[PDB]
């Protein structure tokens, strides 16, 4: 029966629980075939060809084994309005706010999700193949890694997951009879197609819904083929579901890159940073530092799982296997290590294509050769003159982590790396200095809680987890606060940075990119035990920041803290936190809000 539809692998080699999960959903989804993925090169190569024949991907002949997917323009991004978490009680998932709808999560009742589900999945894979992706989040076979099984009817998903996770037969062997996260995904276009297909990219924007059911350990996603919505081990599992597991079992799952930096005397520290949208995350994680004798190496550019070890050090591991980076704005100048990374074995999505088979995008900063022309991400001849970008602004590259020329030697050590500093941020055109340090752990938690970033709109993105909390943010804030009562904890120092402060003409006060290494240098030396006290925390004292080799920098304006800007800031932060967090806001946070007000009132 079922075995008759299997075109690769054997039902009988799957652990029984994996087999039951597959059986239950094949019966539900009614796919024409079952493909058990093995993770092999040969399978990958096979699936690429198949994808090329069908028009899903094009070869990028300028490079070694790169491919380009173009999507339906209705499906170009993770969509938060269609993303929900499902729990018996609303409060376990989001706080009940004082006014408005919560912006800290979107809960759906189990009754509502059951109707939503039944309206979408039965028969959804008719006419297509159901692929079975065994994948590990974390180095294969570690005790501290978690495994999932994602069923999908999208080969683009398979190939992306092979890069972004460890996938294939070795994960099934490691999993044996263990537990796993059940992940079900369908693009939602059963054949025969009921609606047109744009660029050979199936999606069902109307019914798109990305659900998480933490008590069942299930992620169920329907109707988008796009990254955050389809690659379920990354945002769905490694951030949302995990942040909730972590709150239960003593650890943290966070939206942080992790880098190791070494000073000219050979001392090395690992730092973690949580930044909101469009703040240069990959750019910092794989920075080529400008300061002589300094070295930066990349552990991860997006997510980190962290847990206190036996001596109380917070150790991080990057549960991903690759980088799903925003492409526009990537160039040799801004991120030479990212460029080198994506020179081969990479999938690109919604970027532009040169006539010689290369890629292109806003900010790539690479003159075209005489006669080379550009095809945009909508498949049309393109020119600067048309008044739309040649690449979608959320376009991506999906690339093996092992290819980063500065990948850290410890990026896959199953014991993780010891975090000595955590860095929060955002895009703040006015008011917020280049760097400041927290006064205490509780104050550091409040700094993360207070994060805002200009996306002409400025929004709150606390800890850069606003779209990703797996559970009540007030409870997450308690969970972080409680780290300070962990026996012998060695708490990382907390900082906040802003690469985007502008003068009155809107020009950047700070050059950023490699020059950010000057700011990392000061944090590094602060971790080693100097400062100038201000109401918002410590900034570097006069002349402490290393400016050698830079053109002029307006230090005074860059580090300026005005009472008036900050009177409004703290009023905004208070309003936000008391309104959105309400009955769940920890008293430690309340005290930090008041204290900042008190300090600001003293200026
Ligand atoms: Mn991210
Ligand atoms: Na997005």
Coordinates of C-alpha atoms and ligand atoms in Angstrom, one line a residue:
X1 CA 0.0 0.0 0.0
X2 CA 1.9 3.1 1.3
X3 CA 5.2 1.4 0.5
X4 CA 4.0 1.4 -3.1
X5 CA 4.4 5.2 -3.3
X6 CA 7.9 5.4 -1.9
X7 CA 10.3 6.4 -4.7
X8 CA 13.3 6.5 -2.3
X9 CA 14.3 4.7 0.9
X10 CA 12.2 2.2 2.8
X11 CA 9.5 2.6 5.3
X12 CA 11.2 -0.2 7.3
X13 CA 14.3 1.8 8.1
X14 CA 12.6 4.6 9.6
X15 CA 12.3 4.5 13.4
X16 CA 8.7 3.6 14.2
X17 CA 7.7 7.0 15.6
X18 CA 9.0 8.6 12.3
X19 CA 7.1 6.0 10.3
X20 CA 3.9 6.7 12.2
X21 CA 4.2 10.4 11.7
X22 CA 4.8 9.9 8.0
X23 CA 2.0 7.5 7.7
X24 CA -0.5 9.7 9.4
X25 CA 0.3 12.7 7.2
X26 CA 0.6 10.9 3.9
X27 CA -2.9 9.6 4.5
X28 CA -4.0 13.1 5.3
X29 CA -2.2 15.0 2.6
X30 CA -2.6 12.3 -0.2
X31 CA 0.7 12.9 -2.0
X32 CA 1.3 10.8 -5.1
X33 CA 4.8 9.8 -3.9
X34 CA 7.0 9.6 -0.8
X35 CA 10.7 10.5 -1.0
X36 CA 12.7 9.8 2.1
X37 CA 15.6 12.2 1.9
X38 CA 19.1 10.8 2.5
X39 CA 21.0 14.1 2.5
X40 CA 23.4 12.9 -0.2
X41 CA 25.1 15.0 -2.9
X42 CA 23.8 12.7 -5.5
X43 CA 20.2 13.3 -4.2
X44 CA 20.8 17.0 -4.0
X45 CA 22.2 17.0 -7.6
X46 CA 19.3 15.0 -8.7
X47 CA 16.8 17.4 -7.0
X48 CA 18.5 20.4 -8.5
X49 CA 18.2 19.0 -12.1
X50 CA 14.6 18.2 -11.5
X51 CA 14.1 21.7 -10.2
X52 CA 15.8 23.2 -13.3
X53 CA 13.6 21.0 -15.7
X54 CA 10.5 22.3 -14.0
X55 CA 11.6 26.0 -14.0
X56 CA 11.8 26.3 -10.2
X57 CA 15.5 27.1 -10.3
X58 CA 17.9 28.4 -12.9
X59 CA 21.6 27.7 -13.0
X60 CA 24.0 30.6 -12.4
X61 CA 26.7 29.5 -14.7
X62 CA 29.2 32.2 -13.5
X63 CA 29.9 30.2 -10.4
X64 CA 30.4 26.7 -9.2
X65 CA 27.1 25.1 -8.5
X66 CA 24.8 28.1 -7.7
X67 CA 21.2 28.4 -8.4
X68 CA 18.4 31.0 -8.5
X69 CA 14.9 30.7 -7.5
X70 CA 12.3 33.3 -8.4
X71 CA 9.1 33.5 -6.4
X72 CA 5.5 34.6 -6.8
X73 CA 5.6 38.2 -5.6
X74 CA 2.8 37.5 -3.2
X75 CA 5.2 35.1 -1.3
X76 CA 8.4 37.0 -0.7
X77 CA 8.8 36.9 3.1
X78 CA 8.2 35.4 6.5
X79 CA 4.6 36.7 7.2
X80 CA 4.0 37.6 10.8
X81 CA 0.2 38.2 10.4
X82 CA -0.3 34.7 9.4
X83 CA 1.9 33.2 12.1
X84 CA 0.4 31.9 15.4
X85 CA 1.2 29.9 18.4
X86 CA -1.5 27.5 19.7
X87 CA -2.1 26.9 23.4
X88 CA -4.9 25.9 25.8
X89 CA -4.6 29.3 27.6
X90 CA -3.8 32.6 25.8
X91 CA -1.7 33.9 28.6
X92 CA 0.9 31.1 28.2
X93 CA 1.6 32.5 24.7
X94 CA 1.2 36.2 24.9
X95 CA 0.4 38.7 27.8
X96 CA -3.0 40.2 27.7
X97 CA -2.3 43.9 26.9
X98 CA -3.9 46.9 28.6
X99 CA -5.1 48.4 25.2
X100 CA -5.0 47.4 21.6
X101 CA -4.0 43.9 20.3
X102 CA -0.7 42.4 21.5
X103 CA 2.3 43.0 19.4
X104 CA 4.2 40.3 21.4
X105 CA 2.7 37.3 19.6
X106 CA -0.5 36.0 18.0
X107 CA -2.3 33.3 19.8
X108 CA -4.9 31.0 18.3
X109 CA -7.2 28.7 20.3
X110 CA -6.9 24.9 19.8
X111 CA -10.5 24.9 18.6
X112 CA -9.8 27.6 16.0
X113 CA -6.6 25.9 14.9
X114 CA -8.4 22.6 14.4
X115 CA -10.9 24.3 12.0
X116 CA -8.1 26.2 10.3
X117 CA -6.2 23.0 9.9
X118 CA -9.1 20.9 8.5
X119 CA -9.7 23.6 5.9
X120 CA -6.2 23.4 4.5
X121 CA -4.4 20.1 4.7
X122 CA -6.7 17.1 3.6
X123 CA -5.7 16.3 0.0
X124 CA -3.2 19.2 -0.2
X125 CA -0.4 17.2 -1.6
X126 CA -2.3 15.6 -4.4
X127 CA -0.2 15.4 -7.5
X128 CA 3.0 15.9 -5.7
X129 CA 5.8 14.2 -3.9
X130 CA 6.0 14.2 -0.1
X131 CA 9.6 14.5 0.9
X132 CA 10.7 13.4 4.3
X133 CA 13.6 15.5 5.8
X134 CA 15.3 14.1 8.8
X135 CA 17.3 17.1 10.2
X136 CA 19.3 18.1 13.3
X137 CA 19.5 21.6 14.8
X138 CA 23.0 21.6 16.4
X139 CA 26.0 19.4 15.5
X140 CA 25.0 16.0 14.5
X141 CA 24.8 13.4 17.2
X142 CA 25.4 15.8 20.1
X143 CA 23.5 15.2 23.3
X144 CA 22.5 19.0 23.2
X145 CA 21.1 19.0 19.7
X146 CA 17.5 18.6 18.8
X147 CA 16.1 16.6 15.8
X148 CA 13.1 17.2 13.6
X149 CA 11.4 15.5 10.8
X150 CA 9.9 17.9 8.2
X151 CA 7.4 16.6 5.7
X152 CA 7.1 18.9 2.7
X153 CA 5.9 18.9 -0.9
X154 CA 8.6 21.5 -1.9
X155 CA 12.0 20.3 -3.3
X156 CA 13.2 24.0 -2.9
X157 CA 12.6 23.4 0.8
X158 CA 14.6 20.2 0.7
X159 CA 17.6 21.7 -1.0
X160 CA 17.5 24.8 1.4
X161 CA 17.2 22.5 4.5
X162 CA 20.2 20.5 3.3
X163 CA 22.2 23.7 3.6
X164 CA 20.6 25.4 6.6
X165 CA 20.5 22.2 8.8
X166 CA 22.3 18.8 9.0
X167 CA 20.0 16.6 7.0
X168 CA 19.6 13.1 5.8
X169 CA 20.4 9.5 6.8
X170 CA 23.0 10.2 9.5
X171 CA 20.3 12.3 11.4
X172 CA 17.9 9.3 11.3
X173 CA 20.7 7.1 12.6
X174 CA 21.5 9.4 15.4
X175 CA 17.8 9.9 16.2
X176 CA 17.1 6.2 16.6
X177 CA 14.0 5.8 18.8
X178 CA 14.3 9.2 20.2
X179 CA 11.7 12.0 20.1
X180 CA 11.6 14.6 17.4
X181 CA 9.7 17.8 16.5
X182 CA 7.1 17.0 14.0
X183 CA 7.1 19.6 11.1
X184 CA 4.5 19.5 8.4
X185 CA 4.6 22.0 5.5
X186 CA 2.6 22.3 2.3
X187 CA 2.7 24.9 -0.4
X188 CA -1.0 24.4 -0.7
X189 CA -1.5 23.9 -4.4
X190 CA -2.6 20.4 -4.9
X191 CA -2.8 19.4 -8.7
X192 CA -4.5 19.8 -10.8
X193 CA -3.7 23.5 -10.2
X194 CA -6.8 25.4 -9.4
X195 CA -5.1 28.8 -9.8
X196 CA -2.3 30.1 -12.0
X197 CA 1.3 29.6 -11.2
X198 CA 3.6 32.6 -11.2
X199 CA 7.2 31.7 -12.0
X200 CA 6.6 28.1 -11.4
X201 CA 6.3 29.0 -7.7
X202 CA 3.3 27.4 -5.9
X203 CA 1.9 29.3 -3.0
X204 CA -1.5 30.0 -1.5
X205 CA -1.3 33.5 0.0
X206 CA -5.0 33.5 1.0
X207 CA -4.7 30.4 3.3
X208 CA -1.1 31.0 4.4
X209 CA -0.7 30.0 8.1
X210 CA 2.4 29.1 10.1
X211 CA 1.3 27.4 13.3
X212 CA 3.2 26.2 16.4
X213 CA 1.7 23.7 18.9
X214 CA 4.4 23.5 21.7
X215 CA 2.5 21.0 23.8
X216 CA 2.3 18.6 20.9
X217 CA 5.8 19.5 19.7
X218 CA 4.4 20.2 16.2
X219 CA 5.0 23.0 13.6
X220 CA 2.5 23.1 10.9
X221 CA 2.9 25.4 8.0
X222 CA 0.7 26.0 5.0
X223 CA 0.8 28.0 1.8
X224 CA 4.1 29.9 1.7
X225 CA 7.2 28.4 0.2
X226 CA 9.3 31.2 1.6
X227 CA 12.3 30.8 4.0
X228 CA 11.1 31.7 7.5
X229 CA 7.7 30.2 6.7
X230 CA 8.9 26.9 5.1
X231 CA 12.3 26.1 6.6
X232 CA 10.9 25.0 9.7
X233 CA 14.0 24.2 11.8
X234 CA 15.1 27.9 11.8
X235 CA 12.5 30.5 13.1
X236 CA 9.7 28.0 13.9
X237 CA 11.7 25.4 15.7
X238 CA 15.1 27.0 16.8
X239 CA 13.5 30.2 18.0
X240 CA 9.9 29.9 18.9
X241 CA 9.3 26.3 19.9
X242 CA 12.8 26.3 21.5
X243 CA 12.5 29.5 23.4
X244 CA 9.6 27.8 25.1
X245 CA 11.4 24.5 25.7
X246 CA 14.4 26.5 27.0
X247 CA 12.3 28.4 29.5
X248 CA 11.3 25.0 30.9
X249 CA 14.7 23.4 31.0
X250 CA 17.1 26.1 32.2
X251 CA 18.4 27.4 28.8
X252 CA 17.9 30.3 26.3
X253 CA 17.0 30.3 22.6
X254 CA 17.7 33.7 21.2
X255 CA 17.9 35.7 18.0
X256 CA 21.7 36.3 18.2
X257 CA 24.7 36.0 16.0
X258 CA 27.8 34.7 17.8
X259 CA 31.4 35.7 16.8
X260 CA 34.8 35.1 18.4
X261 CA 37.2 38.1 18.5
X262 CA 40.9 37.9 19.2
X263 CA 43.1 41.0 20.2
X264 CA 46.7 41.5 19.0
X265 CA 47.9 39.7 22.2
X266 CA 46.1 36.5 21.3
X267 CA 43.3 36.7 23.9
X268 CA 39.9 35.6 22.5
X269 CA 36.3 36.2 23.6
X270 CA 33.0 35.1 22.1
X271 CA 30.3 37.8 21.9
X272 CA 26.6 37.4 21.1
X273 CA 24.4 40.1 19.5
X274 CA 20.7 40.5 19.0
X275 CA 19.8 43.1 16.4
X276 CA 16.5 43.8 14.7
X277 CA 15.8 44.0 11.0
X278 CA 18.3 45.5 8.6
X279 CA 21.0 46.3 11.2
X280 CA 24.0 44.4 9.6
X281 CA 23.9 41.1 11.5
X282 CA 25.8 39.0 9.0
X283 CA 28.1 42.0 8.5
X284 CA 29.1 42.0 12.2
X285 CA 29.2 38.2 12.5
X286 CA 31.7 37.9 9.7
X287 CA 33.3 41.3 10.0
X288 CA 36.7 41.8 8.5
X289 CA 38.0 44.1 11.3
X290 CA 39.9 47.3 10.4
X291 CA 42.1 47.4 13.5
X292 CA 45.6 45.9 13.0
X293 CA 46.3 42.6 14.8
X294 CA 42.5 42.0 15.6
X295 CA 40.7 39.0 14.3
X296 CA 36.9 38.2 14.0
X297 CA 35.6 34.7 13.3
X298 CA 32.0 33.6 12.7
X299 CA 30.1 31.1 14.9
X300 CA 26.6 32.0 13.7
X301 CA 24.8 34.9 12.1
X302 CA 21.3 34.4 13.3
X303 CA 20.4 32.2 16.2
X304 CA 21.9 30.9 19.4
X305 CA 21.1 28.3 22.1
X306 CA 22.8 29.1 25.3
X307 CA 23.0 27.3 28.7
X308 CA 25.1 27.8 31.8
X309 CA 27.8 25.2 32.1
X310 CA 29.1 23.6 35.4
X311 CA 31.3 26.6 36.2
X312 CA 28.4 29.0 35.4
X313 CA 29.5 30.1 32.0
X314 CA 26.9 30.8 29.5
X315 CA 27.8 28.5 26.5
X316 CA 26.3 29.1 23.0
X317 CA 25.9 26.9 20.1
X318 CA 24.6 27.8 16.6
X319 CA 21.9 25.3 15.9
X320 CA 22.1 26.2 12.2
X321 CA 24.2 24.8 9.4
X322 CA 24.3 27.7 7.0
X323 CA 23.5 31.3 6.4
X324 CA 20.2 32.5 5.1
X325 CA 21.3 36.1 4.5
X326 CA 19.6 39.1 3.1
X327 CA 21.5 39.8 -0.2
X328 CA 21.0 43.4 -1.1
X329 CA 23.6 45.6 0.3
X330 CA 26.1 42.8 0.3
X331 CA 29.4 43.8 -1.4
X332 CA 33.2 43.4 -1.2
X333 CA 33.4 46.6 0.8
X334 CA 30.5 45.9 3.2
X335 CA 31.1 42.2 3.8
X336 CA 34.0 40.6 1.9
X337 CA 33.7 37.4 3.9
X338 CA 30.0 37.0 2.9
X339 CA 30.9 37.4 -0.8
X340 CA 33.6 34.8 -0.6
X341 CA 31.2 32.5 1.2
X342 CA 28.6 32.6 -1.6
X343 CA 30.9 32.0 -4.5
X344 CA 29.7 28.3 -4.7
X345 CA 27.2 25.7 -3.7
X346 CA 24.6 28.5 -2.9
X347 CA 21.0 29.0 -3.6
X348 CA 19.8 32.6 -4.3
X349 CA 16.2 33.6 -4.2
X350 CA 14.7 36.7 -5.9
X351 CA 18.0 38.4 -6.8
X352 CA 18.7 39.7 -10.3
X353 CA 20.7 37.8 -12.8
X354 CA 23.4 39.1 -15.2
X355 CA 23.6 38.2 -18.8
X356 CA 26.7 36.1 -18.1
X357 CA 24.9 34.1 -15.4
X358 CA 26.0 36.0 -12.3
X359 CA 23.9 37.5 -9.6
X360 CA 23.2 41.2 -9.0
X361 CA 21.5 43.4 -6.4
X362 CA 21.2 46.9 -5.0
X363 CA 24.5 47.8 -3.3
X364 CA 26.5 44.9 -4.7
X365 CA 28.9 47.7 -5.9
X366 CA 30.3 45.9 -8.8
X367 CA 30.4 47.5 -12.2
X368 CA 29.2 45.5 -15.1
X369 CA 31.4 44.6 -18.0
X370 CA 30.7 46.3 -21.4
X371 CA 27.8 44.5 -22.9
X372 CA 26.5 42.6 -19.7
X373 CA 22.8 43.2 -19.0
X374 CA 20.6 42.6 -16.0
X375 CA 17.4 40.6 -15.7
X376 CA 15.5 41.6 -12.6
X377 CA 13.9 39.3 -10.0
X378 CA 10.6 39.7 -11.9
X379 CA 12.1 38.3 -15.0
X380 CA 12.2 41.6 -17.0
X381 CA 15.1 43.5 -18.6
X382 CA 16.2 46.0 -16.0
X383 CA 17.9 49.4 -15.8
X384 CA 18.5 52.0 -13.1
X385 CA 15.9 54.0 -15.0
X386 CA 12.8 51.9 -14.2
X387 CA 12.1 53.1 -10.7
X388 CA 12.1 49.6 -8.9
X389 CA 15.0 47.6 -7.5
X390 CA 16.5 44.8 -9.7
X391 CA 16.4 42.5 -6.6
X392 CA 13.6 42.0 -4.1
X393 CA 14.6 43.9 -0.9
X394 CA 14.1 40.6 1.1
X395 CA 16.0 38.6 -1.4
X396 CA 18.4 36.0 0.0
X397 CA 21.4 33.8 -0.3
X398 CA 21.3 30.4 1.4
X399 CA 24.9 29.2 1.8
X400 CA 26.8 26.5 3.7
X401 CA 28.4 27.8 7.0
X402 CA 31.5 25.7 6.4
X403 CA 32.3 27.9 3.4
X404 CA 32.8 31.1 5.4
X405 CA 36.5 31.8 5.2
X406 CA 36.5 33.0 8.8
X407 CA 34.2 30.3 10.2
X408 CA 35.2 29.8 13.9
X409 CA 37.1 26.6 14.7
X410 CA 34.6 26.0 17.4
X411 CA 31.4 26.6 15.4
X412 CA 30.3 23.0 15.7
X413 CA 31.9 22.1 19.0
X414 CA 29.1 20.3 20.8
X415 CA 30.2 21.9 24.1
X416 CA 29.5 25.4 22.8
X417 CA 31.4 28.6 23.2
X418 CA 31.5 30.7 26.4
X419 CA 29.7 34.1 25.9
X420 CA 31.4 37.0 27.7
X421 CA 29.3 39.8 26.2
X422 CA 25.8 40.3 24.8
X423 CA 25.1 43.2 22.5
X424 CA 21.7 44.6 21.7
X425 CA 20.9 47.2 19.0
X426 CA 18.7 48.8 16.3
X427 CA 18.5 51.5 13.8
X428 CA 18.2 54.8 15.7
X429 CA 18.8 57.9 13.6
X430 CA 18.6 60.2 16.6
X431 CA 19.4 60.2 20.2
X432 CA 21.2 57.0 21.0
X433 CA 25.0 56.9 21.3
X434 CA 27.3 54.6 19.2
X435 CA 27.8 52.3 22.3
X436 CA 26.8 52.1 25.9
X437 CA 27.1 49.5 28.7
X438 CA 24.5 48.4 31.2
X439 CA 24.7 49.2 34.9
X440 CA 23.7 45.8 36.1
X441 CA 22.3 42.6 34.8
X442 CA 18.6 43.8 35.6
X443 CA 19.3 47.0 33.8
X444 CA 20.8 45.0 30.9
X445 CA 17.6 43.0 30.7
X446 CA 15.7 46.3 30.6
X447 CA 18.0 47.6 27.9
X448 CA 17.0 44.5 25.7
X449 CA 13.4 45.0 26.7
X450 CA 13.5 48.6 25.5
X451 CA 14.9 48.0 22.0
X452 CA 13.5 50.0 19.2
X453 CA 14.6 50.4 15.5
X454 CA 13.5 52.6 12.6
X455 CA 12.3 50.2 10.0
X456 CA 9.4 56.3 8.0
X457 CA 8.5 54.2 11.2
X458 CA 10.2 53.5 14.5
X459 CA 9.1 50.2 16.1
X460 CA 9.8 48.2 19.3
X461 CA 11.6 44.9 18.9
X462 CA 12.6 43.7 22.4
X463 CA 15.6 41.5 22.4
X464 CA 15.1 41.4 18.6
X465 CA 12.6 38.6 19.4
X466 CA 9.4 40.4 18.9
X467 CA 8.2 38.1 16.0
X468 CA 9.7 35.1 17.6
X469 CA 8.7 34.7 21.3
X470 CA 7.6 31.2 21.9
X471 CA 5.7 32.2 25.0
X472 CA 4.6 35.1 27.3
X473 CA 7.2 37.8 27.0
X474 CA 6.7 38.9 30.6
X475 CA 7.6 35.3 31.6
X476 CA 10.6 35.5 29.2
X477 CA 11.7 38.7 31.0
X478 CA 11.4 36.8 34.3
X479 CA 13.4 33.9 32.9
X480 CA 16.2 36.3 31.9
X481 CA 16.1 38.2 35.2
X482 CA 16.3 34.8 37.0
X483 CA 19.8 34.2 35.4
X484 CA 21.2 36.4 38.1
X485 CA 20.2 34.0 40.9
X486 CA 21.9 31.1 39.1
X487 CA 24.5 29.6 41.4
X488 CA 27.9 31.1 40.5
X489 CA 26.7 32.5 37.2
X490 CA 29.3 34.4 35.2
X491 CA 26.9 36.8 33.6
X492 CA 28.0 38.3 30.3
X493 CA 28.5 42.0 30.2
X494 CA 25.6 43.8 28.4
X495 CA 26.0 46.5 25.8
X496 CA 23.8 48.4 23.3
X497 CA 25.2 49.8 20.0
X498 CA 23.8 52.0 17.3
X499 CA 25.7 52.1 13.9
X500 CA 23.0 54.4 12.4
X501 CA 23.0 57.7 14.2
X502 CA 22.8 60.6 11.7
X503 CA 23.5 64.3 11.6
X504 CA 20.8 66.8 10.6
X505 CA 21.3 66.1 6.9
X506 CA 20.7 62.4 7.6
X507 CA 24.4 61.4 7.0
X508 CA 25.9 58.7 9.2
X509 CA 28.1 59.9 12.0
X510 CA 29.9 56.6 12.1
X511 CA 31.4 54.7 9.2
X512 CA 30.6 51.2 10.5
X513 CA 31.5 48.0 8.7
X514 CA 35.1 47.0 9.6
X515 CA 35.4 50.1 11.8
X516 CA 32.9 48.6 14.1
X517 CA 35.9 46.6 15.4
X518 CA 36.8 49.8 17.4
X519 CA 33.6 49.5 19.3
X520 CA 34.2 45.7 19.9
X521 CA 37.7 46.6 21.1
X522 CA 36.2 48.8 23.8
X523 CA 33.6 46.1 24.9
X524 CA 36.5 43.6 25.0
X525 CA 38.6 45.7 27.3
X526 CA 35.5 46.6 29.4
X527 CA 34.9 42.9 29.9
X528 CA 38.5 42.7 31.1
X529 CA 37.9 45.3 33.7
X530 CA 37.4 52.4 31.0
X531 CA 34.0 54.3 31.6
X532 CA 32.1 57.5 31.9
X533 CA 28.9 57.3 33.8
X534 CA 25.7 58.7 32.1
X535 CA 22.0 58.2 32.9
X536 CA 21.6 55.5 30.3
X537 CA 24.6 53.6 31.3
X538 CA 28.4 53.9 30.8
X539 CA 30.0 55.2 27.5
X540 CA 33.6 55.3 26.7
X541 CA 35.5 58.1 28.5
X542 CA 37.1 60.8 26.4
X543 CA 39.7 59.4 24.1
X544 CA 39.1 55.8 25.2
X545 CA 37.6 54.8 21.8
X546 CA 40.4 54.0 19.3
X547 CA 40.0 56.3 16.4
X548 CA 43.5 55.8 14.9
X549 CA 43.4 55.7 11.1
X550 CA 40.0 57.2 10.8
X551 CA 38.9 60.4 9.1
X552 CA 37.3 62.9 11.4
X553 CA 34.5 61.7 13.6
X554 CA 32.2 64.0 15.4
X555 CA 32.5 62.3 18.8
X556 CA 30.5 64.9 20.7
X557 CA 27.4 64.4 18.5
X558 CA 27.8 60.7 18.2
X559 CA 27.9 60.3 22.0
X560 CA 25.4 63.1 22.8
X561 CA 22.7 62.3 25.3
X562 CA 20.0 65.0 25.5
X563 CA 17.6 65.2 28.5
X564 CA 14.8 66.0 26.1
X565 CA 15.3 63.1 23.7
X566 CA 15.6 60.8 26.7
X567 CA 12.6 62.2 28.5
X568 CA 10.5 61.1 25.5
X569 CA 12.4 57.8 25.1
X570 CA 11.7 56.5 28.6
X571 CA 8.1 57.7 28.5
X572 CA 7.8 55.7 25.2
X573 CA 9.5 52.6 26.8
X574 CA 7.3 52.8 29.9
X575 CA 4.2 53.2 27.9
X576 CA 5.1 50.2 25.7
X577 CA 6.1 47.9 28.4
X578 CA 3.3 48.6 30.8
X579 CA 0.8 48.5 28.1
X580 CA 1.9 45.3 26.2
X581 CA 3.3 43.4 29.2
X582 CA 0.7 44.6 31.7
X583 CA 0.1 42.0 34.5
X584 CA 3.1 40.0 33.4
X585 CA 5.7 42.7 33.6
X586 CA 8.3 41.7 36.3
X587 CA 8.8 44.2 39.2
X588 CA 12.5 44.2 38.5
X589 CA 11.7 45.8 35.2
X590 CA 9.3 48.3 36.6
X591 CA 12.1 49.4 39.0
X592 CA 14.5 49.8 36.1
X593 CA 12.0 52.0 34.2
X594 CA 11.6 54.2 37.2
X595 CA 15.3 54.4 37.9
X596 CA 16.1 55.5 34.4
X597 CA 13.4 58.2 34.8
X598 CA 15.0 59.1 38.1
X599 CA 18.4 59.4 36.5
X600 CA 17.2 61.4 33.6
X601 CA 15.4 63.8 35.9
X602 CA 18.7 64.5 37.5
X603 CA 20.2 66.0 34.3
Ligands
LIG1 MN1 16.8 36.5 11.9
LIG2 NA1 11.2 39.1 6.4

